[PDB]
Amino acid sequence: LARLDKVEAEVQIDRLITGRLQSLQTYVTQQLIRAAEIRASANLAATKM
Amino acid sequence: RFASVYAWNRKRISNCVADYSVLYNSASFSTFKCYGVSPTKLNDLCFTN
């Protein structure tokens, strides 16, 4: 944004948007899987209690 | 007189303050393409060499 004006910057920024957004989807997806596995240990410790 | 393109001249510009508007906004140039830099924001930017 300091080095290209809008019409050209849009081409570059969208590559960063999609690369980052796909990299954040991957984090959230794998946290959903981890959380669902800690939940299984919570439901286990709740009954060992 | 300029160089022959097989013996193309090179000069280093450094330790100075520019004003690329004096170049880009002049009427004489028939071509002023810029790659990875905008011709306008070029004048707001700064370089090592």
From Swiss-Prot, chain A:
Subunit of the fusion protein that is processed upon entry into the host cell. Mediates fusion of the virion and cellular membranes by functioning as a class I viral fusion protein. Contains a viral fusion peptide that is unmasked after S2 cleavage. This cleavage can occur at the cell membrane by host TMPRSS2 or during endocytosis by host CSTL. In either case, this triggers an extensive and irreversible conformational change that leads to fusion of the viral envelope with the cellular cytoplasmic membrane, releasing viral genomic RNA into the host cell cytoplasm. This is Spike protein S2'. It comes from Severe acute respiratory syndrome coronavirus 2. The chain holds residues 981 to 1029 of 1273 of the full protein.
